[PDB]
Design an enzyme around this catalytic site. Structure first.
Site, short mmCIF file in Angstrom:
data_model
loop_
_atom_site.label_atom_id
_atom_site.label_comp_id
_atom_site.label_asym_id
_atom_site.label_seq_id
_atom_site.Cartn_x
_atom_site.Cartn_y
_atom_site.Cartn_z
CG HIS A 1 -2.02 -0.94 1.18
ND1 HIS A 1 -2.69 -1.41 2.30
CD2 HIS A 1 -2.58 -1.53 0.06
CE1 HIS A 1 -3.64 -2.22 1.87
NE2 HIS A 1 -3.61 -2.33 0.53
CB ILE B 1 -3.54 8.18 7.80
CG1 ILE B 1 -2.70 6.95 8.18
CG2 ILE B 1 -2.74 9.46 7.74
CD1 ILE B 1 -1.61 6.61 7.17
CB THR B 2 -8.10 11.00 6.40
OG1 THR B 2 -8.97 9.87 6.47
CG2 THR B 2 -7.36 11.01 5.08
CG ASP C 1 -2.99 -4.40 5.67
OD1 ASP C 1 -3.65 -4.21 4.64
OD2 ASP C 1 -2.53 -3.46 6.37
C1 LIG Z 1 -1.26 -2.61 10.73
C2 LIG Z 1 -1.90 -1.28 10.43
C3 LIG Z 1 -2.15 -0.87 9.16
C4 LIG Z 1 -2.72 0.36 8.92
N1 LIG Z 1 -2.94 0.65 7.62
C5 LIG Z 1 -3.49 1.83 7.36
C6 LIG Z 1 -3.75 2.22 5.99
O1 LIG Z 1 -3.50 1.44 5.08
N2 LIG Z 1 -4.32 3.42 5.80
C7 LIG Z 1 -4.64 4.31 6.84
O2 LIG Z 1 -5.12 5.36 6.53
N3 LIG Z 1 -4.41 3.95 8.09
C8 LIG Z 1 -3.88 2.76 8.38
N4 LIG Z 1 -3.66 2.42 9.65
C9 LIG Z 1 -4.10 3.43 10.64
C10 LIG Z 1 -2.86 4.33 11.02
O3 LIG Z 1 -1.78 3.46 11.31
C11 LIG Z 1 -3.25 5.13 12.26
O4 LIG Z 1 -4.37 5.95 11.93
C12 LIG Z 1 -2.13 6.14 12.62
O5 LIG Z 1 -0.80 5.57 12.53
C13 LIG Z 1 -2.42 6.53 14.09
O6 LIG Z 1 -1.41 7.67 14.46
P1 LIG Z 1 -0.76 7.94 15.78
O7 LIG Z 1 0.19 9.09 15.50
O8 LIG Z 1 -1.75 8.16 16.76
O9 LIG Z 1 -0.04 6.66 16.21
P2 LIG Z 1 1.27 5.92 15.63
O10 LIG Z 1 1.33 6.03 14.25
O11 LIG Z 1 1.46 4.65 16.31
O12 LIG Z 1 2.51 6.71 16.07
C14 LIG Z 1 2.82 6.92 17.52
C15 LIG Z 1 4.33 7.22 17.60
O13 LIG Z 1 4.72 7.54 18.98
C16 LIG Z 1 5.98 6.83 19.19
N5 LIG Z 1 6.04 6.65 20.64
C17 LIG Z 1 5.46 5.62 21.36
N6 LIG Z 1 5.81 5.66 22.67
C18 LIG Z 1 6.67 6.75 22.76
C19 LIG Z 1 7.36 7.31 23.91
N7 LIG Z 1 7.24 6.77 25.12
N8 LIG Z 1 8.12 8.39 23.65
C20 LIG Z 1 8.23 8.94 22.41
N9 LIG Z 1 7.62 8.47 21.28
C21 LIG Z 1 6.83 7.39 21.52
C22 LIG Z 1 5.79 5.52 18.45
O14 LIG Z 1 7.06 4.91 18.24
C23 LIG Z 1 5.29 6.09 17.12
O15 LIG Z 1 6.23 6.51 16.17
C24 LIG Z 1 -3.08 1.21 10.00
C25 LIG Z 1 -2.83 0.79 11.28
C26 LIG Z 1 -2.25 -0.44 11.54
C27 LIG Z 1 -1.97 -0.94 12.94
N1 LIG Z 2 -6.79 1.05 4.47
C1 LIG Z 2 -7.34 1.46 5.60
O1 LIG Z 2 -8.21 2.35 5.63
C2 LIG Z 2 -6.80 0.75 6.91
C3 LIG Z 2 -5.83 -0.23 6.62
C4 LIG Z 2 -5.36 -0.89 7.81
C5 LIG Z 2 -5.72 -0.66 9.08
N2 LIG Z 2 -6.66 0.32 9.26
C6 LIG Z 2 -7.19 0.67 10.53
O2 LIG Z 2 -6.53 0.57 11.73
C7 LIG Z 2 -7.56 0.58 12.78
C8 LIG Z 2 -7.39 -0.59 13.71
O3 LIG Z 2 -7.47 -1.89 13.14
P1 LIG Z 2 -7.82 -3.44 13.45
O4 LIG Z 2 -8.05 -4.22 12.22
O5 LIG Z 2 -6.74 -4.11 14.26
O6 LIG Z 2 -9.11 -3.44 14.41
P2 LIG Z 2 -10.68 -3.06 14.06
O7 LIG Z 2 -10.81 -2.34 12.81
O8 LIG Z 2 -11.36 -2.42 15.18
O9 LIG Z 2 -11.28 -4.59 13.95
C9 LIG Z 2 -10.77 -5.72 14.71
C10 LIG Z 2 -11.73 -6.35 15.66
O10 LIG Z 2 -11.46 -7.71 16.10
C11 LIG Z 2 -12.62 -8.18 16.74
N3 LIG Z 2 -12.51 -8.67 18.10
C12 LIG Z 2 -12.20 -7.97 19.20
N4 LIG Z 2 -11.93 -8.68 20.24
C13 LIG Z 2 -12.11 -9.99 19.80
C14 LIG Z 2 -11.96 -11.22 20.44
N5 LIG Z 2 -11.64 -11.30 21.72
N6 LIG Z 2 -12.17 -12.32 19.70
C15 LIG Z 2 -12.51 -12.19 18.39
N7 LIG Z 2 -12.68 -11.09 17.73
C16 LIG Z 2 -12.45 -10.00 18.48
C17 LIG Z 2 -13.77 -7.15 16.55
O11 LIG Z 2 -14.77 -7.99 16.16
P3 LIG Z 2 -16.04 -7.55 16.65
O12 LIG Z 2 -16.43 -6.32 15.66
O13 LIG Z 2 -17.53 -8.36 16.40
O14 LIG Z 2 -16.29 -7.29 17.97
C18 LIG Z 2 -13.24 -6.40 15.31
O15 LIG Z 2 -13.37 -7.26 14.15
C19 LIG Z 2 -8.92 0.46 12.06
O16 LIG Z 2 -9.48 1.73 12.11
C20 LIG Z 2 -8.56 -0.05 10.65
O17 LIG Z 2 -9.49 0.43 9.72
C21 LIG Z 2 -7.20 0.98 8.19
#
Ligand SMILES: Cc1cc2nc3c(=O)[nH]c(=O)nc-3n(C[C@H](O)[C@H](O)[C@H](O)COP(=O)(O)OP(=O)(O)OC[C@H]3O[C@@H](n4cnc5c(N)ncnc54)[C@H](O)[C@@H]3O)c2cc1C
Ligand SMILES: NC(=O)c1ccc[n+]([C@@H]2O[C@H](COP(=O)([O-])OP(=O)(O)OC[C@@H]3O[C@@H](n4cnc5c(N)ncnc54)[C@H](OP(=O)(O)O)[C@@H]3O)[C@@H](O)[C@H]2O)c1
EC number: 1.18.1.6
Length: 455
Positions: A50, A371-372, A154
């Site tokens: 992605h 992210i948005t 993913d």
């Molecule tokens: C697996 C996955 C895939 C995703 N894919 C997408 C996607 O395809 N598109 C999309 O729009 N969104 C996606 N998201 C959602 C996106 O990741 C979150 O919306 C965004 O990263 C949240 O931002 P944040 O700044 O709150 O947290 P984070 O991005 O986690 O950043 C927090 C930061 O704080 C740092 N930090 C932590 N503890 C400390 C400390 N004690 N001191 C200093 N720094 C510290 C961490 O290292 C990190 O760099 C995904 C999320 C996950 C988990």
């Molecule tokens: N391209 C994108 O826009 C993108 C890409 C990647 C990640 N993200 C985002 O990152 C955020 C977090 O992601 P996420 O996938 O980890 O979580 P999530 O979007 O909240 O979904 C994961 C959850 O796991 C389930 N669940 C919770 N506890 C459970 C348990 N004990 N046993 C079984 N199922 C359980 C919930 O099911 P239940 O609903 O029935 O309770 C729900 O399906 C989301 O906002 C996701 O959209 C976004």
């Protein structure tokens, strides 16, 4: 000269900084980060296939290169510098440190080799240093992912994509190597609720359906009566359900039927099953299955919940990935923390009972936006903070900012990574990528990263 600091350099930290620099012509913003490198989940969460989604790094980079912004990687707030020290040095402090924990399954067998959080597995292929030795065993033929969110998709997509199709992504060479030897041919994505409760979105669902080399496995019985219940659903939701429904119930044309029959891999959705226990191999050395409690739905709308029927199903598999969300973790004694919602308690970004302390992103709202969502939410925090600053609700007078903090860090033996240090490692990662035809080849070893950082 307003001094503000940001804790965490992911999307919340950067968009908060960006809003502050854009709307206050004098303020200085220092961004602190625990990892050696910036960008949080844009680098370590977003999938390598992605790349599109990672383009927000270019605007983060412009902010980090500006005269009124500084970056301090390799600084663990709460350990190397306390929140109170930051509060004493700056007019305002924003906690933007994300949700660094995975929610555990809390089920027996969860300790067997072959069980991982999806988070850890993602951290592994995205080069997060702490997961570099994850070494998942992909010698089994079936993987089971729990949770039907985008993260689940993913991980399934990476496990089933023909490895040659990931060659030109920034996936780690080590993970790609492991994926080339993988024997995984089937991935089941299991939800406790039904089709109407899935949490994934349509881009990701379509990527799975259209993934070359695979066929979809949906049980039409899971969808009986769906068109009827989605007639008053919101457009996006309805479109998603219709795409699922068609995939599950339409008989394919001759060409697609052929393509599906020649596919070597398959993925499917399982509904109404909640994880009860990971089953071991006979010798206890690995996971060999998952015992699922059959469930049925009770309640109306968003209030619907899965309740056990008493029946169980065992599903053989050698890889179990729990993709059931996150929790933030407390960071420091001076910061209130709600163990229940796993957030720093706050009123629209103002941390409860802590003047000068704010929050943004996942640590502010909980772990669920894209992210948005994080961006527009960080902007809201940024508005309240700047209105407090303008209004004179933060300490009057100078505040030293980094001058004071670096002197502490200087004495403590902590040498932060500046953005220019990072630029040196970025160039190296990017150049290394040139020979191999990738966007970059991430450095994973903290020691080697430190050397290439100029440390
Ligand atoms: C697996 C996955 C895939 C995703 N894919 C997408 C996607 O395809 N598109 C999309 O729009 N969104 C996606 N998201 C959602 C996106 O990741 C979150 O919306 C965004 O990263 C949240 O931002 P944040 O700044 O709150 O947290 P984070 O991005 O986690 O950043 C927090 C930061 O704080 C740092 N930090 C932590 N503890 C400390 C400390 N004690 N001191 C200093 N720094 C510290 C961490 O290292 C990190 O760099 C995904 C999320 C996950 C988990
Ligand atoms: N391209 C994108 O826009 C993108 C890409 C990647 C990640 N993200 C985002 O990152 C955020 C977090 O992601 P996420 O996938 O980890 O979580 P999530 O979007 O909240 O979904 C994961 C959850 O796991 C389930 N669940 C919770 N506890 C459970 C348990 N004990 N046993 C079984 N199922 C359980 C919930 O099911 P239940 O609903 O029935 O309770 C729900 O399906 C989301 O906002 C996701 O959209 C976004």
């Amino acid at each position: 000269t307003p001094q503000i600091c940001v804790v965490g350099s992911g999307p919340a930290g950067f968009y908060t900084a960006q809003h502050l620099l854009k709307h206050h012509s004098r303020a200085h913003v220092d961004i602190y980060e625990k990892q050696l490198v910036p960008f949080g989940l844009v680098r370590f969460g977003v999938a390598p296939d992605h790349p599109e989604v990672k383009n927000v790094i270019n605007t983060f980079t412009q902010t980090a290169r500006s005269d009124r912004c500084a970056f301090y990687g390799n600084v663990e707030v709460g350990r190397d510098v306390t929140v109170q020290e930051l509060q004493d040095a700056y007019h305002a402090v924003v906690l933007s440190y994300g949700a660094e924990d995975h929610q555990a399954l809390d089920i027996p067998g969860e300790e067997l080799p072959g069980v991982f959080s999806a988070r850890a597995f993602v951290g592994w292929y995205n080069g997060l240093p702490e997961n570099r030795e994850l070494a998942p065993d992909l010698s089994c033929d079936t993987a089971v992912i729990l949770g039907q969110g985008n993260v689940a998709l993913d991980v399934a997509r990476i496990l089933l994509t023909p490895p040659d199709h990931l060659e030109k992504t920034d996936i780690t060479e080590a993970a790609l190597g492991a994926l080339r030897q993988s024997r995984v041919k089937t991935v089941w994505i299991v939800g406790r609720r039904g089709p109407l409760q899935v949490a994934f979105t349509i881009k990701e669902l379509r990527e799975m359906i259209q993934l070359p080399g695979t066929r979809p496995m949906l049980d039409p019985a899971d969808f009986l009566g769906l068109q009827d219940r989605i007639k008053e659903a919101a457009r996006p939701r309805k479109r998603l359900m219709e795409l699922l429904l068609r995939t599950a119930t339409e008989k394919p044309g001759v060409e697609e039927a052929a393509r599906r029959a020649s596919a070597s891999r398959a993925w499917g959705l399982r509904f109404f099953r909640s994880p009860q226990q990971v089953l071991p191999s006979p010798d206890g050395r690995r996971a060999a299955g998952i015992r699922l409690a059959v469930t049925r739905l009770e309640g109306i709308g968003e209030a619907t919940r899965a309740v056990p029927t008493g029946d169980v199903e065992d599903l053989p598999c050698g890889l179990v990935l729990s993709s059931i969300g996150y929790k933030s973790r407390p960071i420091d004694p001076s910061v209130p923390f709600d163990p229940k919602l796993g957030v720093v308690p706050n009123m629209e970004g103002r941390v409860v009972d802590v003047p000068g302390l704010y929050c943004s992103g996942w640590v502010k709202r909980g772990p669920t936006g894209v992210i948005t969502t994080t961006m527009t939410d960080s902007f809201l925090t940024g508005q309240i903070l700047l209105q407090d600053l303008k209004a004179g609700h933060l300490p009057s007078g100078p505040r030293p900012g980094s001058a004071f903090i670096k002197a502490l860090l200087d004495s403590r033996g902590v040498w932060p990574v500046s953005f220019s240090d990072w630029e040196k490692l970025d160039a190296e990662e990017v150049s290394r990528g040139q020979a191999s035809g990738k966007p970059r080849e991430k450095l994973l070893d903290p020691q080697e990263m430190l050397r290439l950082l100029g440390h």
